[PDB]
């Protein structure tokens, strides 16, 4: 069966978040703000088959993404550059999003979301060879 990502998700683990921003050129004062924002975010997912809504809410920022697997959409890279994105299923339990910048050149960026059999949601965000991993459990 297709996974069901729907719910409210609580972060339990993170690796390399600030490092990812640093290698992307984000200045230290903005990283410090980002890191504070990213410590205790609210994450809501509503999945209806291949249609997703994901809301990630921090003190300073709310991001609402709407996509259907296999259909191009617009978002921004983790460091705030506008991109066209496309999500596909990689496995029964994991989706992968490839991003292309709207204008100009940059590192290859992407993200993945997986729902483990144990009920953990795993997000990764990648810029070239550097990967941030975040793990969440359903509230």
UniProtKB/Swiss-Prot annotation:
Q: Which residues cross the membrane?
A: none
Which parts of the sequence form the motif Nuclear localization signal? 22-32
| Region forming the signal peptide | none
| Assembly, per entry | Interacts with RXR and RARA. Interacts with importin alpha.
Induction per the UniProt record: By retinoic acid.
Q: Impact of altering residue 22 to A?
A: Loss of ligand-induced nuclear import
Which species is this record about? Homo sapiens
What's its job?
A: Transports retinoic acid to the nucleus. Regulates the access of retinoic acid to the nuclear retinoic acid receptors.
| Residue numbers binding all-trans-retinoate | 134-136
The molecule here is called: Cellular retinoic acid-binding protein 2
